[PDB]
C-alpha cells in the first residue's frame, strides 16, 4: 500500500514563564519514530522507534540543529502574529504545522502538504499543486506575500519531491520489519444492561497494526450505522491500536446481531456475536 512521512509541530507561548515550548513529533504510517521537545532535560532529536537507533550521530546532530533553528523561527513567528492580529503580550498562543509526504506502493510521490494553524484555526497552507498558497485570512495574506517573494514554495516543493520522499523510503527500508508488518485484530463482545428492557452490545478490536480498521454491526445483513456509538481508533502503548463500536438492542434479541471486523491483516473479515 501507500506510506507517509508526517511531522506535527507546535510552538506555544507562555508569557511570564520563559520562552515558548516547541515540539516536533515524527511518524511513518501511524508509528512515532522521532521527537524533539524544548522542555526536555537536554533538548535533542531522539529516536522513538528501535529501527532509528541504526542512524548514526550525523543524523541526530543534523536534525537536532534543524529543530533548534525551527524553534527560533517559530518564536519569531509568535511575536510577528501578535502584530498581525493586534494582540497583547500577556496571552498564550499556539502555532501548529503539519508537514509531510505520502508515496504510493511504487515509492513515488502521491501528495505533499504543509499546513499552518494559529490558535486552532487555519492560517496558511500549500495547495496540492505545490506552487501556491491558500491564506485563510488577511493576516495570512501578509505571510503569503512574504513567502512568494522569497521563493518559499519551490523551496518547499523541492523538499517534498526530493528529501521527504527519499528519507521516507530510507525509513521504510531500515524499519521494514516494524513498518511493513500487519498485526491482526483479535475481537470480542461485551454486554451491558440498560433501563427499559434494552441492552448495549459493545464490539472490541484489540492488538492491530496498521491503525486503519472498520467495525460494523449487522442484523440479517443490514448495517446498523444509524444506532452506533464508537470511539476513534486509539493507540494501546506498544505500537498497536484498538477500537470499539456499540449498539443498543432489545433484551433477548442480541443473538441476531453480528459484529464484523475489517482489517488488512485479516485474510477474511471477522464475524462474531455475544457469548453468554
Amino acid at each position: 500500500g501507500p506510506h507517509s512521512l508526517r511531522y506535527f509541530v507546535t510552538a506555544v507561548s507562555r508569557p511570564g514563564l520563559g520562552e515558548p515550548r516547541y515540539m516536533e513529533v515524527g511518524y511513518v504510517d501511524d508509528t512515532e519514530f522521532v521527537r524533539f521537545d524544548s522542555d526536555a532535560e537536554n533538548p535533542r532529536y531522539e529516536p522513538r522507534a528501535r529501527w532509528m537507533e541504526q542512524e548514526g550521530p550525523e543524523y541526530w546532530e543534523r536534525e537536532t540543529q534543524k529543530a533548534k533553528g525551527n524553534e527560533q523561527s517559530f518564536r519569531v513567528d509568535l511575536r510577528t502574529l501578535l502584530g498581525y492580529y493586534n494582540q497583547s503580550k500577556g496571552g498564550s498562543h499556539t502555532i501548529q504545522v503539519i508537514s509531510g509526504c505520502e508515496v504510493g506502493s511504487d515509492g513515488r510521490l502521491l501528495r505533499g502538504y504543509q499546513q499552518y494553524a494559529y490558535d486552532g484555526c487555519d492560517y496558511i497552507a500549500l495547495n496540492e499543486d505545490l506552487k501556491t498558497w491558500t491564506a485563510a485570512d488577511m493576516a495570512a495574506l501578509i505571510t503569503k506575500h512574504k513567502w512568494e517573494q522569497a521563493g518559499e514554495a519551490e523551496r518547499l516543493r523541492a523538499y517534498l519531491e526530493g528529501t521527504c520522499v527519499e528519507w521516507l523510503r530510507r525509513y521504510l527500508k531500515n524499519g521494514n520489519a516494524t513498518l511493513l508488518r500487519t498485526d491482526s485484530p483479535k475481537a470480542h463482545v461485551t454486554h451491558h444492561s440498560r433501563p427499559e428492557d434494552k441492552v448495549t452490545l459493545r464490539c472490541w478490536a484489540l492488538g492491530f497494526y496498521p491503525a486503519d480498521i472498520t467495525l460494523t454491526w449487522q442484523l440479517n445483513g443490514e448495517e446498523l450505522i444509524q444506532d452506533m456509538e464508537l470511539v476513534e481508533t486509539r493507540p494501546a502503548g506498544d505500537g498497536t491500536f484498538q477500537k470499539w463500536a456499540s449498539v443498543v438492542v432489545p433484551l433477548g434479541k442480541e443473538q441476531y446481531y453480528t459484529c464484523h471486523v475489517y482489517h488488512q491483516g485479516l485474510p477474511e473479515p471477522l464475524t462474531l456475536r455475544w457469548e453468554p
Binding site: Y7, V9, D77, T163
Partner: peptide, 8 residues
C-alpha cells in the same frame, strides 16, 4: 527528514 521552516 524534517523541513527547515520559514518565518511568517
Amino acid at each position: 527528514a524534517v523541513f527547515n521552516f520559514a518565518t511568517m
